[PDB]
Design a protein around this ligand. Structure first.
Ligand SMILES: [Cl-]
Ligand SMILES: [Cl-]
Ligand SMILES: [Cl-]
Ligand SMILES: [Cl-]
Lengths: 236, 236
């Protein structure tokens, strides 16, 4: 019964107090669905220029280390939201036609089958939950059931990890005052210091004071980086 | 059976060819759940300074017109994601303690009960689907069922409307070239024209050429507004 399954899982992820409890539960759930491995990968919205990818997996260390050394991240189709439908992606051979080194390496080490579910988080990070299996044998599972179950697992695990302030999911902290945020908003709209001073009935010195403090807080070189980081993560 | 309900609804929203077909189906679904009214509201990510709110409802015109004239949008708690749990919000009296003019106006015109479901879209717009009822009488409905059904309805209606390029959900168009986007990314990271010229092995003239074309395309006063709009909507 899905309604009861769902009821239990929300409560289990609600009550978790550590990252390892989240990872252990995902491992157990993968196992119940008859999967050998999981990986949880998060493409952060920033830096814009080389976005951070953070992960946690039970794949053997040699495989992860190999995936990293071959730069399979650049070709990995399982981490591209454009090829998901309804947040869901059952792996097939066609998926890997532009990622043949990855497909060959994976099949040579014993991987046969897998599935990925994804979600965009409130901070605009993209979370991907993959399950994989070394067995090519048909397991009977309702497509709808698997989809809905992984929908919850990817959301709750990453919501728990967000609540637990985990490095895998957290974007740079921008503890900005109300007034700083207000000035930032006018900045993002293309207003100059002079125009913002008129809008808010303050001096340019005051505007630039606030700009400077926000730059200082996050170690930014200018207001553009502050506004863009704020805009990207939804702080603004 | 939820699995079959879900199967039919995905197909119905997939096959829709107009906005009215989407709205008509939401109206019918509200009615099946025993609701009198629906409203579909979308808080756009931009402009940052007065974010656009676009809506479609079957509420009487006099009510909408009244809600607008009283500026109930400023106090409306049903459109604040901070008070949702799992994207879901069953209306209660406590919800409106800081929105008493709205609650009094609504109850005086005959509203008694309602529910809201929300979703953040790929473009960072926030979509809210509300159902409401003039009857205070207990309807028997499984909380889990109602939650999961509205989860699909809010997603599919707004995904259909995104596919149909509807004004309710679409953010400003930024048809930017690969090279324009690349320069934009370095801009959002805090790089100057000179630094970008060195990074990409081009002249400052070339960099500024591209900046200008992007400014011209969307009618922006400077690169900051272009980068922030791009960053906010996820174009970057
Ligand atoms: Cl989709
Ligand atoms: Cl095979
Ligand atoms: Cl939540
Ligand atoms: Cl009552």
């Amino acid at each position: 019964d899905f309604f009861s399954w769902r009821r239990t899982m929300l409560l289990r992820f609600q009550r978790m107090e550590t990252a390892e409890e989240v990872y252990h539960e995902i491992e157990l759930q993968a196992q119940q669905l008859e999967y050998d491995y999981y990986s949880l990968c998060v493409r952060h919205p920033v830096p814009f220029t080389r976005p951070k990818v953070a992960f946690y997996t039970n794949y053997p260390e040699a495989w992860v280390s190999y995936y990293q050394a071959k730069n399979f991240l650049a070709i990995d189709p399982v981490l591209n939201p454009e090829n998901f439908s309804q947040g869901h992606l059952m792996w097939n051979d066609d998926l890997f036609s532009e990622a043949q080194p990855l497909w060959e390496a994976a099949r040579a080490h014993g991987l046969r089958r897998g599935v990925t579910q994804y979600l965009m988080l409130p901070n605009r990070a993209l979370g991907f939950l993959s399950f994989s299996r070394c067995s090519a044998r048909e397991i009977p599972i309702l497509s709808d059931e698997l989809q809905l179950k992984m929908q919850l697992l990817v959301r709750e695990s990453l919501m728990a990890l967000m609540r637990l302030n985990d490095e895998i999911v957290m974007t740079p902290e921008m503890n900005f005052s109300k007034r700083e945020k207000e000035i930032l908003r006018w900045t993002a709209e293309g207003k100059t210091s002079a125009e913002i001073a008129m809008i808010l009935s303050i001096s340019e010195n005051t505007v630039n004071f606030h700009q400077k403090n926000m730059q200082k807080k996050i170690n930014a070189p200018n207001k553009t980086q502050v506004a863009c980081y704020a805009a990207a993560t939804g702080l603004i």
